[PDB]
Amino acid sequence: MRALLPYLALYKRHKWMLSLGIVLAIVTLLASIGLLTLSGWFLSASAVAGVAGLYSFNYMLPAAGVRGAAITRTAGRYFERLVSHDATFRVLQHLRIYTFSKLLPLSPAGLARYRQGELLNRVVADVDTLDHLYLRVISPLVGAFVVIMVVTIGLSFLDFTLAFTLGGIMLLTLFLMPPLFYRAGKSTGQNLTHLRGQYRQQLTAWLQGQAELTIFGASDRYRTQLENTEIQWLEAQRRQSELTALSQAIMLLIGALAVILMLWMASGGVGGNAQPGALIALFVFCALAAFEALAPVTGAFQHLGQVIASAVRISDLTDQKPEVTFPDTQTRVADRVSLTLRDVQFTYPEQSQQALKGISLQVNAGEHIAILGRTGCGKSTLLQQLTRAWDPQQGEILLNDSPIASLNEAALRQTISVVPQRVHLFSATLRDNLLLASPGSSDEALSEILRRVGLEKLLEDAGLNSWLGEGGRQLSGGELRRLAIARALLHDAPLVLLDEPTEGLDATTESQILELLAEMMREKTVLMVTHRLRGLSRFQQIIVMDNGQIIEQGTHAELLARQGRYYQFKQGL
Amino acid sequence: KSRQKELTRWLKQQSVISQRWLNISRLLGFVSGILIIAQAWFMARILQHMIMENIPREALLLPFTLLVLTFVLRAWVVWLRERVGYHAGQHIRFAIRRQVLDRLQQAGPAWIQGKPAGSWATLVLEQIDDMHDYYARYLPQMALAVSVPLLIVVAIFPSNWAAALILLGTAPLIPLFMALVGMGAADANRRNFLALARLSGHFLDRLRGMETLRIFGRGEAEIESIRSASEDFRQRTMEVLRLAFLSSGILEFFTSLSIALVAVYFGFSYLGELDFGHYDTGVTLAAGFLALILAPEFFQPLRDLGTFYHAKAQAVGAADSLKTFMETPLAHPQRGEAELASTDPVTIEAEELFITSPEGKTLAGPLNFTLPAGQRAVLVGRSGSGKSSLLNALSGFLSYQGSLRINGIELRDLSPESWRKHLSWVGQNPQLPAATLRDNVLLARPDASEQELQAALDNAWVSEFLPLLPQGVDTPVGDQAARLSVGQAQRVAVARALLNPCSLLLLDEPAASLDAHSEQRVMEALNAASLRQTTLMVTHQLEDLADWDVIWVMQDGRIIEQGRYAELSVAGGPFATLLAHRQEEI
Numbered sequence A: 001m002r003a004l005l006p007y008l009a010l011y012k013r014h015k016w017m018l019s020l021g022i023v024l025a026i027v028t029l030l031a032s033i034g035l036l037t038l039s040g041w042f043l044s045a046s047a048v049a050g051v052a053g054l055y056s057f058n059y060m061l062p063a064a065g066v067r068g069a070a071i072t073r074t075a076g077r078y079f080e081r082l083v084s085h086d087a088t089f090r091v092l093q094h095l096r097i098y099t100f101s102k103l104l105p106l107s108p109a110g111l112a113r114y115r116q117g118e119l120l121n122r123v124v125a126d127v128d129t130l131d132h133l134y135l136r137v138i139s140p141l142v143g144a145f146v147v148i149m150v151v152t153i154g155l156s157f158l159d160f161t162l163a164f165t166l167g168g169i170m171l172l173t174l175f176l177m178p179p180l181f182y183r184a185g186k187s188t189g190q191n192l193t194h195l196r197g198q199y200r201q202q203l204t205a206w207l208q209g210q211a212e213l214t215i216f217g218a219s220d221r222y223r224t225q226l227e228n229t230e231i232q233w234l235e236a237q238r239r240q241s242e243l244t245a246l247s248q249a250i251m252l253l254i255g256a257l258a259v260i261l262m263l264w265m266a267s268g269g270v271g272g273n274a275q276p277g278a279l280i281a282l283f284v285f286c287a288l289a290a291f292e293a294l295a296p297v298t299g300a301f302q303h304l305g306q307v308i309a310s311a312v313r314i315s316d317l318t319d320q321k322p323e324v325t326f327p328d329t330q331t332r333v334a335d336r337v338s339l340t341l342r343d344v345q346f347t348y349p350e351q352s353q354q355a356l357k358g359i360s361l362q363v364n365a366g367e368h369i370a371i372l373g374r375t376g377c378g379k380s381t382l383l384q385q386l387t388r389a390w391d392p393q394q395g396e397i398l399l400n401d402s403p404i405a406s407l408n409e410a411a412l413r414q415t416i417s418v419v420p421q422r423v424h425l426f427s428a429t430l431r432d433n434l435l436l437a438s439p440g441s442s443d444e445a446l447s448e449i450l451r452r453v454g455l456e457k458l459l460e461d462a463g464l465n466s467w468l469g470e471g472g473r474q475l476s477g478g479e480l481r482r483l484a485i486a487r488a489l490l491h492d493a494p495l496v497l498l499d500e501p502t503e504g505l506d507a508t509t510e511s512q513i514l515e516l517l518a519e520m521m522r523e524k525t526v527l528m529v530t531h532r533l534r535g536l537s538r539f540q541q542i543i544v545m546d547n548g549q550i551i552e553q554g555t556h557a558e559l560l561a562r563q564g565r566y567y568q569f570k571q572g573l
Numbered sequence B: 001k002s003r004q005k006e007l008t009r010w011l012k013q014q015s016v017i018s019q020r021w022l023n024i025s026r027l028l029g030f031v032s033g034i035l036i037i038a039q040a041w042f043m044a045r046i047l048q049h050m051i052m053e054n055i056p057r058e059a060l061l062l063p064f065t066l067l068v069l070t071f072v073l074r075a076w077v078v079w080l081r082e083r084v085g086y087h088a089g090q091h092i093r094f095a096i097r098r099q100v101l102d103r104l105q106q107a108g109p110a111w112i113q114g115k116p117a118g119s120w121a122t123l124v125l126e127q128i129d130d131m132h133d134y135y136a137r138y139l140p141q142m143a144l145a146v147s148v149p150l151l152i153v154v155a156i157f158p159s160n161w162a163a164a165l166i167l168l169g170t171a172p173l174i175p176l177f178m179a180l181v182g183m184g185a186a187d188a189n190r191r192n193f194l195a196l197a198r199l200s201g202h203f204l205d206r207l208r209g210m211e212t213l214r215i216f217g218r219g220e221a222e223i224e225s226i227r228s229a230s231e232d233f234r235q236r237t238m239e240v241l242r243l244a245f246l247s248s249g250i251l252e253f254f255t256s257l258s259i260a261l262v263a264v265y266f267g268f269s270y271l272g273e274l275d276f277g278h279y280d281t282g283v284t285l286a287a288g289f290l291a292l293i294l295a296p297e298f299f300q301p302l303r304d305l306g307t308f309y310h311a312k313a314q315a316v317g318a319a320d321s322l323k324t325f326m327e328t329p330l331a332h333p334q335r336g337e338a339e340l341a342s343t344d345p346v347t348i349e350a351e352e353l354f355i356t357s358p359e360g361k362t363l364a365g366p367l368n369f370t371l372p373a374g375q376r377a378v379l380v381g382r383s384g385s386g387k388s389s390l391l392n393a394l395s396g397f398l399s400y401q402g403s404l405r406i407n408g409i410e411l412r413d414l415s416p417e418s419w420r421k422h423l424s425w426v427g428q429n430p431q432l433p434a435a436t437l438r439d440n441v442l443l444a445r446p447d448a449s450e451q452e453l454q455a456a457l458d459n460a461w462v463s464e465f466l467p468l469l470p471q472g473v474d475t476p477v478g479d480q481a482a483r484l485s486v487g488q489a490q491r492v493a494v495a496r497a498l499l500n501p502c503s504l505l506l507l508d509e510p511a512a513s514l515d516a517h518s519e520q521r522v523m524e525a526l527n528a529a530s531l532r533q534t535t536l537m538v539t540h541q542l543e544d545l546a547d548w549d550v551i552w553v554m555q556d557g558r559i560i561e562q563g564r565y566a567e568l569s570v571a572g573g574p575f576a577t578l579l580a581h582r583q584e585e586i
């Protein structure tokens, strides 16, 4: 319950639309009770009057209350649906923005949980469930409470005992019955979640390993237990509807008890009257209509547990410490970047050596550099600490004679343009996949890049308007790499970080791309990690190294002249 | 005409699976209408005695008892009708899920790997379960919406025919107000749900790519993009909803008017202003209460049908995905009845082979190779050249329109169940589907001797890293073998393939992205295993293919070069270019 406080405070942005939608729900329910209560009284009042009371009845006042309670019930229902649906989409937008703003400062590290793609499909589902707190939890429960109180208060001007026993029955089953059924079905809802993820775990294994199961003749016996999990899963759902059937038969029995009590008690006297003629129907027809408000309260409290379970999950992610902070100072981005590294761990420690002294690289204001590592020995994590994904625990990373940590976040992204190994194709137009780099850029200047980087094929049909990503027009590694290079060229930054370019590509695209770097990024300082000895002759100051330690370094001719580690690379393997 | 009509039509054609349950719920809903009428009759009768005749409540014990008994019966029927409703939707989901899994196993891995594993769990778990409330609640309610209201009138008409016409007068009006504009804004609502689900994929797209938004400094420009996309959806949805909520508001007007008209008619009939609507026997107070008590329940089944709107809306969206899934045409590989005579190494033959995807696309062009029995061959080439398609076609996962003869017998004519017992495979991705590490190795034959398990564990070098596992050979691999690394999970796949003898061993880049140690142990076991039967290995480790007697260079789905390493490395052709490009990886 205390988990929902951060997301209840998001309601302050839209508090008049969210409170109008609850007020309109209360008014609509009160007009339904007030119409059937007035109608019930009017029949018994006119019946006891008879023909004799025809000319001394004053039916004009009820006539103004029967048309009043009809307009506010049809217009109250129409606008309660309208207002509470607009309000629901307002908080969904504000939940998506709030979650995105909290998830971004901790994007690389605090969010890289196991099966991140499967986590994010569970993040989006939790934001949707937090959006259901207003219409599916708060409005039914607050609306029922106010309707009971107004009915109890307004019905107490006739009889305190009768109004308090009717409102006492309705208040007890609003505060005691929803908690009782949540507690009763708590155990059945726990193995229902256990058996649902067991089925998803067994289905994924049976579907992903369909090629392995068919060849080894096990696809039939592993579907047998998959359908056996469904039988147990469907059994737990049967025991969950066995309890929703009870909460609807007991709601009908409680609303019957109120009517029987109103019939029995109001005949012994309403107020001080020994025989209340038309006042029995006023109380009996109030108990008939007032229990419409209590219909959703048990299912609303049931959904509150789901909303709370989502509130802890979202708060687990968002309320993490962003390990990287950026000063709020305006700085001038330089046209030349002289990157220098001092005692920095080029690779995450392997085998827990703890004695790997950081490298001492030095990249001048215009020179290309290629760090030649070995495959599978260790993930780089050098361009991660160079884009301030995390602070370097080893040494100092100075950026143009100044520390990297003393640079504004906005000015840090304008001085470094990194192409990553995993390049993301946003589900948007090709224009939107490239305006990412430069947000203000001419449409023709945008199109010139595509031709320049060897991606003329994307301008054939609906060029710069075709939908990329899940919508369609998927790209392969050869052409998806070119888009990453295209972004780094629109993002005109003095320093370019090349992460494993030309990896997994054929020999033809690799030569077309390495020639792109050498002629496109001629005035820029690139820092490329390859473990591929192709095109390094054009990269001055090659850095060949193993075990996170620079063995030797220099220009390509110097490496071959001394006949060292680099010479064995070309000469042997 | 409308897409939503052929989806609601599809949903009812699926409802015949549990028609006994829907008929019981329709019969129990008719019993509810009788008990609602009887309950209102004992209330109207009691109220008349207590108001007009001033009868003390202690002399009305018999009508009070009958009113309590008919309330308990009403609660019992609701309990029964709610449990019967679940059984209707459960047996429909169980049969559709069986159809989806049957159709997803017939298609095979050739079609399963087209979409991510999460895209298939969504269709099977989340989307099939989205249809339950349509069969459990909406269909029983839409049958109640015609049974109870027409039964209320039949009970009011004998007592008073003017109160019956008030309810029956609005009976055809209500349908033409939510079918004139309601049907106009019903498919529009269905498209709004698609937009909401698509807007939910625009949020997930921005979440999945915040590593790219971070490095480009576009974090504050995608908050506006979320704001713009969310505001465009709401503005478009609320304009549709301004017409779709009229049906809810109109139905609330006609239940208000009918309650008012019943009160006005009966109220002024007691005062003597009106003298019609009865059978000249005089209007009583019980006649007016019976109509007034039953006036809300004339419209309640229709008012509760709007509560169940999302049950239908979320099932039409689910039926949208499940109707296209069950109606896409797939090209299954033709299966025969013939069996192979002996378990000796098979001979592979091709003659203008054309591998075809399940959607009909041609994967590999004309192949005219020939692999004698017991000979070890290598498939090489650039990515996307059809090397895995040739292995998938030999496994029986892909259909071909040429010649592919195993020991002289076509592969179409071979029975897939008995062919694959003469076949072992490793695959590009391990995919250990069993529970523990021991059950994954024994997947070929679970009931094998403990000694034979140790022989396979030792040959594949799985035994050497077993002490490093918390539980040993019984260590659960977990979700997608996350417990053990890819290099040591690939050795479990190797031990699985070597547990049973085979006539053909298919290796699909078995050492692609392993660490340098598992590179050694896998190729140690697989070079020794390739000598015992016919073997076809796909690889890019072109340096080690010296003792393999056949090398096929596959490009653009076509084998463009054949020969051994001695003559291919020096010929300066397609393989020399591939070898030269391979020599740069360190």
Ligand code: ISW
Residues within 6 Å of the ligand: A085, A088, A131, A132, A135, A136, B188, B189, B190, B192, B193, B196, B237, B241, B244, B245, B247, B248, B305, B306, B307, B308, B309, B310
């Ligand atoms: C997700 C978020 C959300 C949410 C939460 C929600 N939602 Fe809704 N609707 C309705 C209703 C309703 C309700 C009440 C019921 C009960 O009581 O239970 C509730 C509660 C709710 N709703 C909620 C109707 C009518 C019905 C009548 O009355 O007749 C309609 C038409 C519509 C529509 C729509 C759309 C578009 C299409 C959309 C999007 C959406 N929607 C959304 C959402």
Ligand SMILES: Nc1ncnc2c1ncn2[C@@H]1O[C@H](COP(=O)(O)OP(=O)(O)NP(=O)(O)O)[C@@H](O)[C@H]1O
Residues within 6 Å of the ligand: B110, B111, B357, B358, B361, B363, B381, B382, B383, B384, B385, B386, B387, B388, B389, B390, B428
């Ligand atoms: N089931 C399929 N449906 C449609 N296209 C497919 C299917 N399987 C493969 N393809 C495509 O057909 C071509 C050949 O693919 P494939 O046979 O996997 O080549 P490959 O050489 O094994 N690739 P790789 O393992 O990455 O080096 C590529 O365009 C594939 O993406």
Ligand SMILES: [Mg+2]
Residues within 6 Å of the ligand: B387, B388, B389, B428, B508
């Ligand atoms: Mg392949």
